Design a protein around this ligand. Sequence first.
Ligand SMILES: NC(=O)C1=CN([C@@H]2O[C@H](COP(=O)(O)OP(=O)(O)OC[C@H]3O[C@@H](n4cnc5c(N)ncnc54)[C@H](OP(=O)(O)O)[C@@H]3O)[C@@H](O)[C@H]2O)C=CC1
Ligand SMILES: NC(=O)C1=CN([C@@H]2O[C@H](COP(=O)(O)OP(=O)(O)OC[C@H]3O[C@@H](n4cnc5c(N)ncnc54)[C@H](OP(=O)(O)O)[C@@H]3O)[C@@H](O)[C@H]2O)C=CC1
Ligand SMILES: NC(=O)C1=CN([C@@H]2O[C@H](COP(=O)(O)OP(=O)(O)OC[C@H]3O[C@@H](n4cnc5c(N)ncnc54)[C@H](OP(=O)(O)O)[C@@H]3O)[C@@H](O)[C@H]2O)C=CC1
Ligand SMILES: NC(=O)C1=CN([C@@H]2O[C@H](COP(=O)(O)OP(=O)(O)OC[C@H]3O[C@@H](n4cnc5c(N)ncnc54)[C@H](OP(=O)(O)O)[C@@H]3O)[C@@H](O)[C@H]2O)C=CC1
Lengths: 381, 381, 381, 381
Amino acid sequence: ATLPAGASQVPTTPAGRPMPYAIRPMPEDRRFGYAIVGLGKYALNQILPGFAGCQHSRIEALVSGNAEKAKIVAAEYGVDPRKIYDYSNFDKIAKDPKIDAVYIILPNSLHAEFAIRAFKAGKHVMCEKPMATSVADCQRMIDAAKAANKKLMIGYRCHYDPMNRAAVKLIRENQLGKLGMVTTDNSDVMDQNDPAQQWRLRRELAGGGSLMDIGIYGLNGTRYLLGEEPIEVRAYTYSDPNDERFVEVEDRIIWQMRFRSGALSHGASSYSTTTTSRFSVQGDKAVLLMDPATGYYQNLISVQTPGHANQSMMPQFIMPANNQFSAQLDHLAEAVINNKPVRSPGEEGMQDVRLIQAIYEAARTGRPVNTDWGYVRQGGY
Amino acid sequence: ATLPAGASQVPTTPAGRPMPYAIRPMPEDRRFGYAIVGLGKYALNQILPGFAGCQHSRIEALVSGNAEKAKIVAAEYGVDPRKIYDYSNFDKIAKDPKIDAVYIILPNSLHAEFAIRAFKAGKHVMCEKPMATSVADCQRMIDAAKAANKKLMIGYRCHYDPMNRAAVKLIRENQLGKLGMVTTDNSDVMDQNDPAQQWRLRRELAGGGSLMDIGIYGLNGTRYLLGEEPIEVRAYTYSDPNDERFVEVEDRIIWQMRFRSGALSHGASSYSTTTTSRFSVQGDKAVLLMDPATGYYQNLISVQTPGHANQSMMPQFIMPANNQFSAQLDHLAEAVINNKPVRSPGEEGMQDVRLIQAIYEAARTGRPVNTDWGYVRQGGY
Amino acid sequence: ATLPAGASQVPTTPAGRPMPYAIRPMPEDRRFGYAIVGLGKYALNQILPGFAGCQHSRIEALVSGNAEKAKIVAAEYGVDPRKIYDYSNFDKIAKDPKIDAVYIILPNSLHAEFAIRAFKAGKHVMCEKPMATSVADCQRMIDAAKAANKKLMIGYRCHYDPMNRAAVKLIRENQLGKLGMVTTDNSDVMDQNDPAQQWRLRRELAGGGSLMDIGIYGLNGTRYLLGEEPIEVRAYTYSDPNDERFVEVEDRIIWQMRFRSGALSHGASSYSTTTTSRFSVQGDKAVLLMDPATGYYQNLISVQTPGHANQSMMPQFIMPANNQFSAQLDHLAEAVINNKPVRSPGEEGMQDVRLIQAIYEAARTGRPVNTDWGYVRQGGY
Amino acid sequence: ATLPAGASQVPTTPAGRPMPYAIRPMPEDRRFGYAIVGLGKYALNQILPGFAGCQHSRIEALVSGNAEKAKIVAAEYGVDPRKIYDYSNFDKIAKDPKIDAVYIILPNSLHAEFAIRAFKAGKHVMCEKPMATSVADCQRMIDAAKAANKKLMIGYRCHYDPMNRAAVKLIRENQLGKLGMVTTDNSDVMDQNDPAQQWRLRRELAGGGSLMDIGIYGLNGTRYLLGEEPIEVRAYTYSDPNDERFVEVEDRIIWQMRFRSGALSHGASSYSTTTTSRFSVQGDKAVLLMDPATGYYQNLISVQTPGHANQSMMPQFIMPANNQFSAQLDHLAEAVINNKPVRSPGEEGMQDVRLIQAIYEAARTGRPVNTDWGYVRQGGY
Ligand SMILES: NC(=O)C1=CN([C@@H]2O[C@H](COP(=O)(O)OP(=O)(O)OC[C@H]3O[C@@H](n4cnc5c(N)ncnc54)[C@H](OP(=O)(O)O)[C@@H]3O)[C@@H](O)[C@H]2O)C=CC1
Ligand SMILES: NC(=O)C1=CN([C@@H]2O[C@H](COP(=O)(O)OP(=O)(O)OC[C@H]3O[C@@H](n4cnc5c(N)ncnc54)[C@H](OP(=O)(O)O)[C@@H]3O)[C@@H](O)[C@H]2O)C=CC1
Ligand SMILES: NC(=O)C1=CN([C@@H]2O[C@H](COP(=O)(O)OP(=O)(O)OC[C@H]3O[C@@H](n4cnc5c(N)ncnc54)[C@H](OP(=O)(O)O)[C@@H]3O)[C@@H](O)[C@H]2O)C=CC1
Ligand SMILES: NC(=O)C1=CN([C@@H]2O[C@H](COP(=O)(O)OP(=O)(O)OC[C@H]3O[C@@H](n4cnc5c(N)ncnc54)[C@H](OP(=O)(O)O)[C@@H]3O)[C@@H](O)[C@H]2O)C=CC1
């Protein structure tokens, strides 16, 4: 019994070694450059910090309305101080060839504006959800992309989150059997004192209440989990008339949907209840519980059958996939580099907007709203 | 250091000792005699086996339409063969003073008449849920109870299940804060080859589909967790038109409600997907997840807040409270012995039936139904 | 679409129906009669209540040194008052052919003599663990069983518990790979004021401390999970010198073992810390976690690998296998009826006692003790 | 009912906003500069990627023996190509004032060498665990720090991991009661083909097997969880003599310890079994289960009592504390900036080395090894 070759050949003195094994995503290059517009809560707590983990993305320039703040951040992330644009001279980015695309992290109402604006600046557009505050503005955004022959991608991080991906895969492998009932809930207690929440209370700025904000996850999720689109929709909303927070936007709203397969779904969103992100998919073989379902971190899914609960979550020492944020950034970057369509196109973001408007209409009229308008998810869910 | 008195006084030879510490409910007496009506699935799998752990209840007689089966069951539970009754000679139980009550475990359409004949026979009545198949019949049962001066109790085992009572208690202790959103789901794959499910597919016998059968748990649970009644309901139901199972009763139905406190709820029942029994109660301080929520066994609850999940379930060595079945049985017994009302009276069962009829009515018309009819829960939830 | 034959043939009036689907063990007969010896804590809290779910067992007689208590217990379980025995007139059970066996639930030092007198009385014997307080006495019990041509079974409920048998099965199916490390812990806070614990603090009656009482589960479990016997043990024990509870028996003791396969294990038992019952079995493919591992209820197992945790526990509506207590009771009954050996014979109980004596011997000398004495598990683990 | 001031004052046109709320650690400055020596598996998968999240640390220079690789990394992390040292001219760092400290991520045997070497280069030292391969080399490292009046810190990330910190806090708050039994297990299947594992198989390079490598976590953990030091130690080790992997170092080893408080602990480490990081702390009120206990990610702790399991883990949307890696880096950085002692000093790393040697001695001799040498954890655990 003797030691193996490798071990026996290791010098007992300081010596160089080969490239170590990768048990986590390693940085490769930094060829794609982003222009981030809107230094808000998401842009600073989740997005910018997300670039560090990218393999193909960098922060080349940032666009802000607050010059003093924009100066402080530029330092932290080391972006060229001379590359700190504003809303007035945002259009001038078309002069910088090192600015491949822009990432719009502005209030919902301002999405369409800077999207078509950037498209005429010859840049790729990564717009946050919800796409826009109007089906029309969504289509105009698509038109600008086509006209400029550029890429339009919506910020659906769940489309690039490991656990969410595992959930879809397991369903496509038929581990749940025939799908028949989906249940979604997304909630967070609205704080009017938080600067980021203030515009969300303004209807012309947000476009809607909790649905447009977080209920969209359940809606979108119900869609890619089931792998199909709603053909009919019904909904109801209610808000405490005495709560100053919901004068213009809805607090909570409940929507029921039917699909071509015969599958049904019921879900809700809320501005008056604590943190909730839970999805449930019922097949005739098993039931999947995603909880947390769409968190920034610590997602956890479980396939349940009588006597069993098979849970999956990110490992404790290894990282077989990149976090949703970095994976999202690089996804646009490498969709361009390889001339490939993006998984989350403007047509997909436009689909949620229509459905949401159809849902509001259903809650407004109290009648079923037909949504069987032949939409097709290009490239699968 | 020396040994304590107790240990040092134990004889080393065979000797009598004290009553031991009780770590689970001990039997006490079998003073309250039941007559079980309908030796079917729930009866033979859950109720009859549930008598063993009772502290005041016993099986005195059986009522069956299958003499061969009754004879076998009677022998299995030491019942006197002379105490076997036909559905035709049922009324003669009035002649046996050793029969204090009957437990009706027949198809839904037959609960009313046998409860009424039981009262005419001067016996107390325990009746399974759903109470009956018409509001009118529920009232006739209540009128007969009062006319005979005997008690009327509906089989809501979840009203005597330790984990459900624990969820109710943490809610009343304001551990979730102000309640805003409740979500329920109760499902099971319908198998037309199971004899018990055969009458469930007949509208005339079942009185309805998945809502009457298992959706009632979500409905009833939403009411006792919130501790209040709904003021209006909305709903929609769908069933694949080609599925032989749902020609007369509904498969899947979704109902949402609004309560006087402002709270909302969305729930669903299914005959088309596998085992699901899950309740979530969202407050503005924390979120409660009951899953399993209403199982015959293994219920599990969890209070969730960012970074935490405090779970509760039955201990592994001790049994602080009796199981739901034995408890329910003794509950009616203790109520007559002590001359007190029951927690699940006929009025409670009637309220669920009225709400279910409202829900079916709301699904049928696609319009909301006002249910603000002033039902008051006597004794609390 | 029309209704299936079954549903359409159900009468709408009161009518007899078929035997229902069984979703839990149904009673069958009570052919095997037991005489319970020692109406203490385990007997009244677990064993007597366990007879209800038996399919072939019944309580025929009681043996107690507290006539007042026996009279009460007899009435609680419908036992014939004439079937109450003294520890002095115990031998006269030989005169009752309706008594097939006895279940010895007395302090450890008294198991041997009453098992022997039981055999002399021509009865089968179920004896609680630990089998006895000396290896020699275990052999005398075995010799008496053989001399009387009656069976000898030790109360190892975990050998008939669904979750433990499920853990054994996944192990034998190589789901963990090659077994290398097993960890066990069994603890409970000793309370000298509980009558049952009083003899446990007396060396002469208990035969030892925490190892004899509950550490035996870790020991016995390590053997059936690994499916092999230890070839040597090592150990150390410690007990606060000023604590009146541990003047004669040990509080905490740690023992580690090596098996012929190469596998190792380290476990411990405690009278000083709260409820703990946890087993982990490390293989090179996956890790098994049993926690609760040996509870009277709610056992839970999980197979863990990076990114996964597949849990198993008893279902919420169905009961595939009978509870451990009822199962253990019927097991001896089926063994004599069918003329077969039991899974927990006297030899099995004797092996644990020999191993425990080796462990105490290893702790006492601080030296390792060779236990490679060729015990062979008849019938498998 | 009107909208609140904040919301109503938000311009519906592009405008600048204030600094957003922080729900996650924000980058502040980058004043402290690190010199990372040893571009291995940890340095590249966990450490370097860890700087991005720091608030006070940057990568100023890297030391490697592989020039080609060192060139590739420098690009990825953008370190000055002219600042790529090697083992020969490592000493020259003393000339760069922008190099505040060095982080040694070299094989165990080479820890002492470059530590004292860097101390004479007038730099602060952050050495990875285990400190060194000799108690003596540990003391020499301490001497160099004192002589150079610099800071010596060991890489105990668990000392700066949220969940591990929560575990200590809860124990100090007495939520477990009086501590009496700790159980630890740390395992990973050794792969001789992995370049990083090859030196670990060499005794003069690693200093020991699984204990020195990962068993140290259980040892260290047992120490800060209990908040005290071992006074006595016993151990045993075994390795398959036919396995080429363990010719020089131990595969698995089991060690038992006793503390001044009377608390006991049993734990093990393994090179032949799958991923395992589990700690268990038993008090007389509750039991704590850390599993994962010391993972790079996804740690999970739980306080258990009969009927309860209160779990804690990182939130799903917020990040109230920085990850162990970044927190570790900045900790040295800010320990210098504020002239404060470090929580993980060389004296603490030296303590584990002694205990480990004492443990090996115990396993070698098979006798108890006294470790009551008056060590004192400066600054608490
Ligand atoms: N997918 C996900 O997980 C998340 C997506 N989002 C989305 O990101 C977008 C930004 O929202 P969020 O960061 O939370 O909110 P914030 O209120 O915190 O920030 C909005 C940002 O847009 C700019 N802005 C321009 N005009 C206005 C205006 N009139 N009122 C307010 N801000 C303005 C500001 O940049 P500056 O001050 O520098 O001038 C500000 O930092 C939204 O579309 C939201 O739906 C948000 C959170 C998560
Ligand atoms: N609370 C709970 O958890 C549960 C409550 N239930 C309730 O108990 C009641 C019985 O349901 P369940 O045991 O599942 O069903 P089953 O179909 O299995 O049994 C019904 C029984 O009633 C008698 N019966 C008399 N006339 C008829 C008839 N015309 N058609 C069918 N049966 C007849 C039969 O007994 P016999 O042969 O002896 O004449 C039969 O076994 C229902 O109201 C149901 O809602 C059911 C399951 C669970
Ligand atoms: N497998 C399992 O899960 C468990 C097994 N056990 C085992 O069962 C056996 C009994 O333990 P347990 O029920 O907890 O203890 P108890 O002390 O509560 O009862 C022992 C019983 O035996 C009789 N007895 C006769 N002589 C004595 C004596 N001198 N001192 C004390 N009792 C005497 C008494 O019955 P009477 O008054 O009627 O004369 C007494 O109630 C033990 O061997 C124990 O290891 C215990 C718990 C669990
Ligand atoms: N706390 C924690 O979580 C962890 C701590 N560690 C610790 O980090 C240290 C490094 O181990 P690890 O990264 O896993 O192992 P690696 O084998 O992957 O790397 C060792 C590094 O040290 C340098 N080195 C110098 N001389 C030698 C030599 N003779 N043989 C091998 N390498 C040499 C090499 O740098 P170059 O090739 O560039 O010249 C090499 O990259 C160890 O002390 C280990 O205990 C490791 C993992 C986790």
